[PDB]
Design an enzyme around this catalytic site. Structure first.
Site, PDB file in Angstrom:
ATOM      1  CD  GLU A  77      -6.170   0.841  -2.815  1.00 32.85           C
ATOM      2  OE1 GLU A  77      -6.015   1.974  -3.356  1.00 32.85           O
ATOM      3  OE2 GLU A  77      -5.280   0.248  -2.145  1.00 32.85           O
ATOM      4  CG  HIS A  78      -6.611  -0.512   3.017  1.00 35.11           C
ATOM      5  ND1 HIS A  78      -5.600  -0.776   3.916  1.00 35.11           N
ATOM      6  CD2 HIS A  78      -6.331   0.694   2.473  1.00 35.11           C
ATOM      7  CE1 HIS A  78      -4.703   0.189   3.855  1.00 35.11           C
ATOM      8  NE2 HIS A  78      -5.144   1.113   3.019  1.00 35.11           N
TER       9      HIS A  78
END
Ligand SMILES: COC1=C(OC)C(=O)C(C/C=C(\C)CCC=C(C)C)=C(C)C1=O
Lengths: 54, 49, 423, 446, 54, 57, 54, 105, 146
Positions: free
Chosen positions: D60-61
């Site tokens: 997600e990062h």
């Protein structure tokens, strides 16, 4: 400070016979509360000297 | 970092019916409470006597 | 297909009241009553009266007791809320459609028949302290409060939240006088969402013919400028720096709203470098890591504040502010693209459109327009108006900011935050 | 005017199609000039190991920092210049990436989501940057007492199981996790039977399918094969975790029984009963006169600064109860009153409150589903969990079916005489002993 | 001052507590029979029976 | 263009019967959760966030 | 005071044989005790309230 | 209207005088039993009336103590007896009863 | 602070200085509320070590002898070296601070940069003050020369 207030036993006696806010006001008809208590112990104390002998 | 907290293993202590991470516990509950409650019932029964 | 929509219906009544409804065919309903009654219409003698008022929205009315307002609304799963800004108060009410009529009655009761009973109002005063305490646990709330205080002599300088000295001091006569003088027909609009226009027009003609406190958006805010400064250590300097822009719904307002999107509002991309943000990019060249900047754009009836809002580390404060400032200066001196402006235009256009996607948002905007403007203005023409902002208008807006007597608020360990003087 | 029942039938069919591939592709269409797209993935955390926990978080990062086709902040610059917003979340069970855009922009939106969800440049330079960002995020999170207690409550309730884990993982994994580790998980999970592309707003569904076949063709490829597993069941224990810290001024408590999870009919009745109890907060107007006895007593006797009911909801399991925040001196009274609500409801639920109940729900459901973003998420999540969109008129019918008997039955099944998971944090001296908590889950009178 | 207590919810509350308050009497009575060895009722009882009558 | 708040900037407070007290507008935080050690409270002497009336089957 | 003087009757009568006069007054005083406390003193207090517009 | 309701008024005025709280400066509402509703109404009283209320009760408890009465001028007249509490009492009850009806449904 | 600030003048003169100076004179006599409980034993330690030094000091005595003082001083008050200079240097800046109240009465002070102590210009100001008017001279007086 004042040990009447703080000491666990005396506390109880203070809350009940000393510092207890009571009305300004209450009449001779109020006195029978104590007098029952007096009668109660006087019964006990004459009762017991009876039981020694009964 | 409060994420480094895992709960210690209680396997030594866990009753058998509750040993599998892979299976539900809702099942053994009944027998488990049943069992522990029976003990207390039985006890009062005796006490009553 | 979903259907044929409907159109908004819109009626100026001859006493100055506005009514708008949509029948979007929704399972639930929204009625707002919007009132020119925001904190700006408080004076020196009654400050905070409208805060207490905002809190007072379920004290007893003439047949409806507090208990009923609460119990009646919860019984249907309804909602009753009030939103002040500095210009208006908005009592909005939300329930399923089968239940409008009960929620309407409570609404009109709250807004036209409060009793403000002595004992109920006394009980309510502590809530100002709690309410303020919650709000003010944003550093931004303090800053924007002091920002306005600094910018204006007048009326817009008043806070959204009751001054501490006033807590417990605002009377049932003050609330009584507030409602009688501000909650009147020509100061009012009644917006409805999945109700019918007949039903609203009826409610309005029956229940909302109230003449005569007051007129005019009209103290008139006097811009003044100057600075307020709150020593802290909080972790971080919050600072805002601002000059007089343009009243809402003027053309010049839209130029400012474009200039904002040139410079940079919020993020678009979760954990993003914010690559099209002029201000951010500009600060970041100078400044290693943790900061924020955004362009700040407040428009009122009367007036408006533009510039920017910085969060930094205390030592980096001057550097962040001084960078941000120069970046604006750079637009004023003429360094803007065409596509730079076009992307702002898209950011703004898309943004507006998105803010009206939903019942809460549409309704607030329709309400806001009714009072601001006496019109409904459909989104295609909002987009039309946005599009009419020239590049030179945007430059000229920056030019206005840069040359304008300034207004500043800052809180933190301020010993490296500059002084105006020094900008 | 139309009636409310009339209005429930009015909302268009959510429209489902599949690729020859297993990407489900779905639309609720409307008149709005504005939409929400993207991709809901059956990937999770419940899916990661112990080794390789924090991974989906770590993706997600990375997901937005470049593709092979859009290197560096190229993607960012594209989303921003059309005024779109790009966003993501990961839960224990579910990852989402979504764009809010203009509806004319639905070509590029789906296109970018394709690129993100398939071509993620996990550049070694960047994975090194994001490890420091995430460790910062972990330090951030420890200060959110609320965020903590729920992690604790997961940690203790599902001790032993993948469901015990955080989304972010522990410090050590973030510190250690490799490029290899991540593409491993990515290969494992981001495969097309486990994705829905949802959209909502001013779109045609035909138009969306074209964009699906255009930009998602070949993931399962040919592929999945070999090593799909599903999830195992997670054991619920219950059990207490108590993090005593008299330096934080208010206590947090979270207390829950096991729920049944997504699929089960009797969530509707649990949510009804939950709504009767509801939620408080000290900024609620009307105190004293609130319906919910818990809320009423909480406000009058200042017991509390907030509380909230919940029905957290996983595959085949659940956390059902309540969270609150209070003075150190109040934890007991607050415990008492919450338990007493549960038990009153197990034994003696009455008809009127159950209707209030049902109404609060109908109001919640309809209010929540307002906006392309909420609706898109609902397409989204629902397809992953349920297999359909359950339409609004259904939920109404399922809400309508609950009476008092339904409540006191369904409350009884889940709550009566059951061991809870308890979690405490803060000045928690006065938090009841587990036995005494446990003993408040039944009445001697009943 | 009696009066308060009469209504749909109270009717509901009554009914929900009926199984319990009659299960309590069942507890009460069996309890009272056992603890006194009552004779009248206990003569009926198909084990218990053979403690007096023989 | 007129919504004096979500022109997106000045403050709007919001009270309620039912849901929870809100404040406004724009101002950053917003690109600053994101670089980091920006805590804050979540939950001391206080109140709950996004919140409620917000839900499910 | 009627209660007190009724009690004074009742004390006299129990001090006193169960035989002609004696019985029926004793019977009536008995009724009166129960009548004052159950019925008559309650009704007086209601009457007194009505007289105070209360 | 008529000549008969001023016998009822005469009987009322008599009982009033017989009650004899006026002999100790008291108003009728000074003498009300403080139950829950009554307690709330005292609470709702404004500062002036509460302050006069307490002084009245202080006066009478003082007399009551030394088993005295006021001079006949300074007794409170039947006419003139000010029922300051009743509007507040009525309203407290009105609310308690609304609560009580809501509790039934 | 609570005692001191129950004069309205204390608040005013505090805000007066705050407004007048960027710098150093702008600091208050009384600890900022945010600091109460926050000032450390290291801060006090560092304060005394850096400011309570020989060149910053004087020892005045009244009915003591000069020998005794000179002795005390040479024995006990040879402390070198924090700092020098009266010397931040106060920067005058100007501007205004405003506290809404109802207190009964507006207290206001209005002021401009004058002259450092012991300059000649200082004495001119001290005369101008007495032209314009300091305190009373005459109990319950009309203050006729003011
Ligand atoms: C003025 O009126 C009174 C009270 O109220 C205000 C009391 O509280 C007591 C306390 C009771 C006592 C000392 C005796 C009781 C003894 C036993 C054993 C129970 C007394 C005497 C009393 O006269």
């Amino acid at each position: 400070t004042n040990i009447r207030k703080s000491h666990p036993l005396m506390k109880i006696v203070n809350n009940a016979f000393i510092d207890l806010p009571a009305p300004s006001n209450i009449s001779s008809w109020w006195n029978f509360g104590s007098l029952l208590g007096i009668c109660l112990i006087l019964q006990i104390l004459t009762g017991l000297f009876l039981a020694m002998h009964y | 970092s409060h994420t480094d907290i895992k709960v210690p293993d209680f396997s030594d202590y866990r009753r058998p019916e509750v040993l599998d991470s892979t299976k539900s516990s809702k099942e053994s509950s009944e027998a488990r409470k049943g069992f522990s409650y029976l003990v207390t019932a039985t006890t009062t029964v005796g006490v009553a006597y | 297909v979903p259907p044929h929509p409907q159109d908004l219906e819109f009626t100026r009544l001859p006493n100055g009241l506005v009514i708008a409804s949509l029948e979007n065919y929704a399972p639930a309903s929204r009625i707002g009553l919007f009132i020119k009654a925001g904190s700006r219409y408080e004076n020196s003698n009654n400050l905070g009266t409208s805060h207490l008022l905002r809190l007072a929205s379920s004290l007893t009315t003439k047949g409806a007791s507090s208990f009923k307002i609460t119990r009646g609304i919860e019984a249907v799963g309804g909602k009753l809320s009030v939103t002040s800004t500095r210009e208006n108060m908005a009592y909005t009410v939300e329930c399923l459609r089968d239940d409008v009529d009960i929620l309407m009655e409570f609404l009109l009761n709250v807004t036209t028949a409060p009793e403000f009973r002595r004992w109920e109002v006394a009980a309510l005063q502590p809530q100002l302290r709690i309410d303020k305490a919650v709000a003010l646990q944003n550093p931004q709330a303090h800053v924007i409060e002091n920002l306005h205080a600094a910018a204006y002599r007048n009326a817009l300088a008043n806070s959204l939240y009751c001054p501490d000295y006033r807590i417990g001091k605002v009377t049932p006569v003050e609330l009584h006088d507030y409602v009688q003088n501000h909650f009147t027909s020509a100061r009012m609009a009644l917006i409805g969402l999945g109700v019918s226009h007949p039903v609203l027009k009826q409610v309005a003609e029956q229940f909302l013919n109230i003449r005569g406190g007051l007129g005019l958006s009209g103290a008139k805010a006097k811009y003044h400028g100057g600075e307020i400064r709150e020593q802290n250590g909080d972790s971080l300097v919050h600072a805002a720096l601002v000059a007089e822009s343009a009243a809402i719904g003027s053309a010049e307002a839209n130029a400012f709203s474009v200039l904002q999107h040139v410079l940079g509002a919020g993020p678009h991309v979760k954990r993003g470098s914010n690559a099209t943000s002029s201000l951010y990019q500009a600060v970041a060249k100078g400044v290693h890591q943790p900061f924020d900047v955004s362009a700040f754009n407040a428009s009122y009836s009367d007036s408006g504040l533009f510039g920017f809002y910085t969060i930094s580390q205390a030592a980096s404060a001057g550097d962040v502010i001084k960078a941000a400032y120069n970046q604006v200066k750079t637009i004023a001196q003429g360094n803007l693209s065409n596509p730079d402006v076009q992307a702002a235009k898209n950011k703004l256009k898309a943004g507006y459109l998105m803010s009206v996607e939903s019942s809460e948002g549409f309704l607030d905007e329709v309400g806001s327009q009714a009072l601001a403007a006496g019109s409904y203005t459909p989104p295609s023409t909002v987009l039309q108006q946005i599009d009419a902002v020239a590049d030179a208008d945007v430059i000229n807006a920056a030019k206005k900011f840069v040359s304008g007597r300034k207004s500043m608020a800052a809180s933190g360990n301020l010993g490296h935050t500059p002084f105006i003087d020094e900008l | 005017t139309a009636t409310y029942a009339q209005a429930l039938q009015s909302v268009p069919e959510t429209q489902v199609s599949q690729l020859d591939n297993g990407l489900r592709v779905a639309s609720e269409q409307s008149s709005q000039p504005t939409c929400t797209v993207g991709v809901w993935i059956d990937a999770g955390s419940r899916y990661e190991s112990e080794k390789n926990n924090g991974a989906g978080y770590f993706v997600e990062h990375l997901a937005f920092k470049g593709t092979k086709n859009r290197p560096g902040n190229a993607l960012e610059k594209e989303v921003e210049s059309m005024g779109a917003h790009l966003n993501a979340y990961s839960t224990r069970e579910h990852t989402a990436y979504y764009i809010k855009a203009l509806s004319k922009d639905l070509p590029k939106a789906v296109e970018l989501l394709a690129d993100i969800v398939q071509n993620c440049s996990l550049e070694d330079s960047q994975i090194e940057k994001e490890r420091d960002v995430i460790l910062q995020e972990l330090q951030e999170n420890d200060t959110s007492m609320r965020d903590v207690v729920f992690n604790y409550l997961h940690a203790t309730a599902f001790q032993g199981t993948p469901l015990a884990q955080s989304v972010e993982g522990p410090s050590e994994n973030v510190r250690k996790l490799s490029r290899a580790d991540l593409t491993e998980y990515l290969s494992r999970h981001y495969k097309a039977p486990r994705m829905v592309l949802a959209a909502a707003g001013g779109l045609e569904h035909r138009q969306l399918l074209d964009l699906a076949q255009k930009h998602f063709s070949g993931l399962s490829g040919t592929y999945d094969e070999d090593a799909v597993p599903t999830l195992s069941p997670c054991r619920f224990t219950g059990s207490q975790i108590c993090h005593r810290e008299d330096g934080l001024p208010l206590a947090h408590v979270a207390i829950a029984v096991e729920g049944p999870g997504w699929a089960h009919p009797d969530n509707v009745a649990l949510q009804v009963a939950n709504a009767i109890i509801g939620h408080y907060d000290c900024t609620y107007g009307g105190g004293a006169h609130l319906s919910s006895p818990l809320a009423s007593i909480a406000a009058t006797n200042k017991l509390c600064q907030s509380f909230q009911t919940f029905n957290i909801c996983y595959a085949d399991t659940g956390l059902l109860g309540a969270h609150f925040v209070c003075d150190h001196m109040s934890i007991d009274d607050m415990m008492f009153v919450l338990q007493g609500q549960w038990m009153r409801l197990c034994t003696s639920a009455t008809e009127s409150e159950v209707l209030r109940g049902k109404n609060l729900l109908r109001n919640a459901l309809v209010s929540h589903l307002d906006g392309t973003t909420p609706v898109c998420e609902d397409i989204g999540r629902s397809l992953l969990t349920y297999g359909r969109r359950i339409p609004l008129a259904e939920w109404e019918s399922r809400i309508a079916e609950v009476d008092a008997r339904v409540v006191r039955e369904v409350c009884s099944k889940y709550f009566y005489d059951q061991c809870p998971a308890v979690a405490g944090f803060g000045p928690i001296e006065q938090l009841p002993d587990y036995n005494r908590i446990r003993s408040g889950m039944f009445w001697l009178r009943f | 001052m009696l009066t308060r207590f009469l209504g749909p919810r109270y009717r509901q509350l009554a009914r929900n507590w009926v199984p319990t308050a009659s299960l309590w009497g069942a507890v009460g009575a069996v309890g009272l029979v056992w603890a006194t060895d009552w004779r009248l009722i206990l003569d009926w009882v198909p084990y218990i029976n053979g403690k007096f009558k023989k | 263009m007129l919504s004096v708040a979500a022109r997106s900037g000045p403050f709007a407070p919001v009270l309620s019967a039912t849901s929870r007290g809100v404040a406004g507008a724009l101002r950053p935080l917003v690109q600053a959760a994101v670089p980091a050690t920006s805590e804050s409270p979540v939950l001391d002497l206080k109140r709950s966030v996004l919140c409620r009336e917000s839900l499910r089957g | 005071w009627a209660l007190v003087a009724d009690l004074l009757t009742l004390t006299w009568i129990g001090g006193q044989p169960v035989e002609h006069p004696y019985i029926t007054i004793g019977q009536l005083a008995s009724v009166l005790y129960f009548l004052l406390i159950l019925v008559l003193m309650p009704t007086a207090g209601t009457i007194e309230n009505k007289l105070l517009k209360w | 209207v008529s000549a008969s309701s001023r016998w009822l008024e005469g009987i009322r005025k008599w009982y009033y005088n017989a009650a004899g709280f006026n002999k100790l400066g008291l108003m009728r509402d000074d003498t009300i039993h403080e139950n829950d509703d009554v307690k709330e109404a005292i609470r709702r009283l404004p500062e002036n009336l509460y302050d006069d209320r307490v002084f009245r009760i202080k006066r009478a408890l003082d007399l009551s103590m030394r088993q005295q009465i006021l001079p006949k001028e300074q007794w409170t007249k039947y006419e003139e007896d000010k029922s300051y509490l009743e509007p507040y009492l009525k309203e407290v009850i009105r609310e308690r009863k609304e609560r009580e009806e809501w509790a039934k449904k």
